Every structure is written in structure tokens, then in C-alpha cells.
């Protein structure tokens, strides 16, 4: 039969200027709303939502993906490691109802991308098309990576969403955003102290730092130091392999690349199991709320 | 003043939790990814001790008045091009003034 295949259909008459003006309502309520989760704001939760409903992509029978919007239906919803995310879809629906023609899909990948620009980051190209698709494309529970892994693990889960050494390393490079809540995931503290501007930080602090290994209130073990951060194994995974680590430490040295790196592997994480016509429209790029004079 | 005056005791909630990663609370505090902010008004840019600033943060030299200080927190990197302050910024009148009101009181 081979896979199935996910053709990017364009709304109805919709254009840039129409995703434009979604992205600036979520820019401003992302602006608004600056009172959750201690004043990091909505930035991180965002661009975990994105990864998420995009990190269920199993490429070899092409189910899952950003394309069927499907985190609205109770199983994927309700999935243990997307937990916290549903603060995510809260802060969305209003802009949903505000623009009822957009796909589910389309809008949580369009958070994840207004996200990180607004929070300084590099220019993430973003494409409409993915349409919603019913209760029984819903992916099964589990496919989203776990913490308490190494580098071998990492390796070859990502292998799945078709990543290679470079693209993971850069798209780990988005932890240097938000923090890990104990009561959402059972790991506990920032990576950074700037957890809502998109830096390099990441890298740096992996690096740089003082890493002692504990125990968290959730008797889960995570690496944390002096500085009062912390790191997932999964993270600290980056140092300990050799091919891993020149990569961390190429990021550490150069913004630019890291910048140029992660808009290139975020965008085909969040274009993964979608079908582009040659008819299609290129890939747009949004204007910034600074960069319309807000 | 233009800026008006009032919290000392819900700007220490905006300070622990928008600036305490960096921020000390009291004098020969440590600068960690930022430096100890006592004494900071009436103080130019980039004069404590013991911490290296981007040139652009000693550059600016600027006098830290309640004034100039709030077009600073609403865009860092506006005000002072090439600071590594990474800080999204304080888009509310309220959040600065408030803020403002307990630096003015914490940093004497
Ligand atoms: C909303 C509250 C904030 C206020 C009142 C504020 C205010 C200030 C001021 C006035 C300075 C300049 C000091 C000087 O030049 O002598 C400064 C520097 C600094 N603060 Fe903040 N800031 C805020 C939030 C934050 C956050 C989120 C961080 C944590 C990452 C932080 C990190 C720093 C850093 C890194 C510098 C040093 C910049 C450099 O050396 O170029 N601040 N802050
Ligand atoms: C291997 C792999 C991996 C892992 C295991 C992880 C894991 C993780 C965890 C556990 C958490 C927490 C949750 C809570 O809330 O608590 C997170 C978060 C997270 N995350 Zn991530 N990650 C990852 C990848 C990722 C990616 C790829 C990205 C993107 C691009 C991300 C982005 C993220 C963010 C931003 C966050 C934050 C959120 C908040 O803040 O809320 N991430 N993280």
C-alpha cells in the first residue's frame, strides 16, 4: 500500500497576510499574558507544543505528524508526557475562535514558530496546509522521548523522526527556554536564567557548569549546579558522547550557526509527513511585533 | 515625578521572580550572570566592581535615574545595543513603576 500520504491543502482563499495577523494576535497575547509560570510567560510552553503534536511522527508508515491537528482528541491530549501542555491549547483556543478557519494543526505549529521568534530568536519559514484528520488517525500513547535515557537512546529516537547527529543537538538547543515542573514531568528547575529569550545558553551552561548528579522531591535523578540549574540525562547525553559533544561545543562558540541550524531542523520537524504541491505557495516568513513597530 | 510611586512589596515579587536568577538582595552581593544592583541610581552604566560588561553596557555611560532606567527594562537591547542582558522586557507601565519603587527602596 506503502505509507499514506499527507497532501498540504491551503485553506480556502487564505494568504501571508492572513497567517500574518494570526501570529500577531498569539505575539500579543504572548505579550499580554506575561503573568504565567512566574513571569517566563507563555513563550516555552508554546514551542513544547509544537515539538509535541510533531514529535509523534513515526517515519516509516507516516502516521502521526503536525498535519491531523490531532492533540485535541482525549488520547493524545491526556498523554503522560504531555503533560502541562494543556495550558498551551488554552491560551490558544481563544485565538482559534478568533480565526475559525485555520487548521489545528497549522495553528499549534504557528505557536511554536511565533514563539520563538518573539522571544528574539532566529526566522523560522512556515508553511500553511496541514488540515485536520478524525479520532481514529489519533497516534497511541508513548512515542515522545523519555528523560531518564543516554545518548544511545536519543540517537536512535530521533532516527524515527528522520533527524540526524546535528539537527538533534540543534534542536535540543530550545531547552534553554523554560523550565521542568515536578508536577508535570518529575523533574524540577531551569537549564538557564534566561528562560524566555532564545540564546545559545544551553550549550553554554552544559558546558561551563558545575553538573553533580541528585535526586529531586520526585525521586527521579537530575544533574544540577551551583548556579541553582539543571539538566535531564538526556541533556547531559550531549557532553558524554564525542560526536554529540563537538557539536555543543561548535554552538557554544557560534550564535549564527546554532540560529541558521535549529530554523532549518524546527521547520522540518514541524513539516514532517507533509506532502507540498508544486502549486504550494514558498514558505513565509513573519514580521516581528518589533519589526512592525510594537 | 512622571514615574509615579508606589510598591515596595509587590515589586519584591517581580524581582524574585523576573530578576533574582541574576539580581542580589544586598550590598557586596555577588554579580552572577549580572551585577549587584546596589547603588545603581546615581551610578553610571557599567561601574561595579569586580564584573566585566559588554562594552556596549560602559559604552552607553548613562546616569541610572528612575527615568531612564524604565526605557531600559521595556527593551534592553534597544536601549543599549550589544548587552548580553537577555531580557524580554517589562511592556507594562505598572510592572515598572512598581518595580522601580522597590529598586529605589532595596538599592539605597
Ligand atoms: C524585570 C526586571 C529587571 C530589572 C529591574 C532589570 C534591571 C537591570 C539593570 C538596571 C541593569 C544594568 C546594571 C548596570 O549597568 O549597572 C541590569 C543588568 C543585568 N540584569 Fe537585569 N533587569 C531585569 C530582569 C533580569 C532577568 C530576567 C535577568 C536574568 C537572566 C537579568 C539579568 C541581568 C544581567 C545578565 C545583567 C547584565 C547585563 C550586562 O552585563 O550586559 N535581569 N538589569
Ligand atoms: C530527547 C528529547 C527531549 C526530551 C526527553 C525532553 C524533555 C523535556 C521535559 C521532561 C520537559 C519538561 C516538562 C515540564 O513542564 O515539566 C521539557 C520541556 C521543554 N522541552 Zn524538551 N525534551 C526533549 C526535546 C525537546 C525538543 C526537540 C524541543 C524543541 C525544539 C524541546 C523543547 C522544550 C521546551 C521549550 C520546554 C519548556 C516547557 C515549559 O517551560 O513549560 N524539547 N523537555
Known amino acids: 500500500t506503502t505509507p499514506l500520504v499527507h497532501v498540504a491543502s491551503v485553506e480556502k482563499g487564505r494568504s501571508y497576510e492572513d497567517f500574518q495577523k494570526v501570529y500577531n494576535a498569539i505575539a500579543l497575547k504572548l505579550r499580554e499574558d506575561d503573568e504565567y509560570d512566574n513571569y517566563i510567560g507563555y513563550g516555552p510552553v508554546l514551542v513544547r507544543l509544537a515539538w ?3 514529535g509523534t511522527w513515526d517515519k516509516h508508515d507516516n502516521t502521526g505528524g503536525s498535519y491531523g491537528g490531532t492533540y485535541r482528541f482525549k488520547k493524545e491530549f491526556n498523554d503522560p ?4 501542555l494543556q495550558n498551551g491549547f488554552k491560551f490558544l483556543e ?29 526566522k523560522i519559514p512556515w508553511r500553511c496546509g496541514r488540515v485536520d484528520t478524525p479520532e481514529d488517525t489519533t497516534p497511541d500513547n508513548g512515542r515522545l522521548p523519555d528523560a531518564d535515557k543516554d545518548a544511545d537512546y536519543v540517537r536512535t529516537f530521533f532516527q524515527r523522526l528522520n533527524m540526524n547527529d546535528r539537527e538533534v543537538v540543534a534542536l535540543m538547543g530550545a531547552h534553554a527556554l523554560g523550565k521542568t515542573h515536578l508536577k508535570n514531568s518529575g523533574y524540577e528547575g531551569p537549564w538557564g536564567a534566561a528562560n524566555n529569550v532564545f540564546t545559545n545558553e544551553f550549550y553554554l551552561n552544559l ?13 527521579n535523578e537530575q544533574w544540577d549546579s551551583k548556579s541553582g540549574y539543571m539538566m535531564l540525562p538526556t541533556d547531559y547525553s550531549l557532553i558524554q558522547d564525542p560526536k554529540y559533544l563537538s557539536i555543543v561545543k561548535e554552538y557554544a562558540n557560534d550564535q549564527d550557526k546554532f540560529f541558521k541550524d535549529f530554523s532549518k531542523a524546527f521547520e522540518k520537524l514541524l513539516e514532517n509527513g507533509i506532502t507540498f504541491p508544486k502549486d504550494a505557495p514558498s514558505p513565509f516568513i513573519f514580521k516581528t511585533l518589533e519589526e512592525q513597530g510594537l | 515625578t512622571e514615574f509615579k510611586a ?3 512589596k509587590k515589586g519584591a515579587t517581580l524581582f524574585k521572580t523576573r530578576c533574582l536568577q541574576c539580581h542580589t538582595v544586598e550590598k557586596g552581593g555577588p554579580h552572577k550572570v549580572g551585577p549587584n544592583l546596589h ?12 564584573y566585566s560588561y559588554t562594552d556596549a553596557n560602559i559604552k552607553k555611560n548613562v546616569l541610572w535615574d528612575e527615568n531612564n ?10 536601549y543599549i545595543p550589544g548587552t548580553k542582558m537577555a531580557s524580554g522586557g517589562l511592556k507594562k507601565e505598572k510592572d515598572r513603576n512598581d518595580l522601580i519603587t522597590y529598586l529605589k527602596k532595596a538599592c539605597e
Open chain 1, 52 to 54: 509535541h503534536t510533531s
Open chain 1, 94 to 122: 481563544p485565538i482559534h475562535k478568533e480565526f475559525p478557519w485555520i487548521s489545528s494543526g497549522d495553528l499549534f505549529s504557528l505557536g511554536g514558530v511565533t514563539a520563538v521568534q518573539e522571544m528574539q530568536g532566529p
Open chain 2, 39 to 50: 547603588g545603581i541610581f546615581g551610578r553610571h552604566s557599567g561601574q561595579a566592581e569586580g
Open chain 1, 207 to 219: 558546558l561551563n557548569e558545575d553538573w553533580k548528579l541528585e535526586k529531586n522531591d520526585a525521586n
Open chain 2, 69 to 78: 532606567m524604565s526605557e531600559y527594562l521595556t527593551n534592553p537591547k534597544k
Open chain 1, 81 to 84: 508526557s504531555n503533560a502541562g
Open chain 2, 6 to 8: 508606589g510598591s515596595a
